[PDB]
Design a protein around this ligand. Structure first.
Ligand SMILES: OC[C@@H]1CC2(CCOCC2)CN1c1ncnc2[nH]ccc12
Length: 167
């Protein structure tokens, strides 16, 4: 039993809700919140911009030190950093950005990072400003993630469309 509330159950391990991931994180304080990161950890917009703003830029400060030491992530890769005031940890995961010409097959590799954590709050990788089809993102998620994932879907029309089209 966990403290996630109001989610629709899609499969044995995948749950979904229309929610602002920032407000969800602030309520639940999950062990892991997933960020829709880029390889440079520059949290300018989308989910990443929102989560960073909610940390008063502390996420960006920590991220800049991470990059200075380790260099950029790989597309499809991840790193674990602090969750600041939002969660215990933040798993920064880089899904392919279609608006950069990045390979969509890497989306499965991106979701594989979730399997290293028993429970996560997360957005749909590569959706929104990353330019991929959110219906496809949800499908790859369901077919790749085996741990317990609670998906927060921002757009209402996106959420109802995601539920009504789910196979
Ligand atoms: O789940 C991925 C979605 C996709 C998105 C861009 C395209 O469609 C509109 C929404 C932004 N994402 C978010 N999801 C949950 N919480 C969020 N907070 C701020 C953004 C955000």
């Amino acid at each position: 039993v966990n403290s996630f509330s109001g989610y629709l159950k899609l499969t044995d391990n995948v749950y979904i809700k229309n929610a602002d991931i920032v407000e969800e994180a602030k309520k639940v304080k999950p062990t892991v919140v997933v960020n829709a990161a880029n390889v440079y950890l520059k949290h300018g917009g989308g989910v990443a911009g929102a989560l960073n703003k909610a940390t008063n830029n502390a996420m960006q400060v920590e991220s800049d030190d991470y990059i200075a030491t380790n260099g950029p992530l790989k597309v499809g890769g991840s790193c674990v950093l602090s969750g600041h005031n939002l969660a215990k940890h933040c798993l920064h995961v880089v899904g392919p950005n279609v608006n950069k010409g990045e390979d969509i097959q890497l989306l499965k590799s991106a979701y594989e990072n979730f399997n290293q954590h028993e429970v996560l709050l997360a957005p749909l990788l590569s959706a929104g400003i990353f330019g991929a089809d959110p219906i496809h993102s949800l499908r790859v998620c369901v077919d790749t993630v085996r741990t317990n994932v609670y998906l927060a879907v921002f757009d209402k029309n996106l959420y109802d469309k995601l539920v009504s089209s789910f196979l």
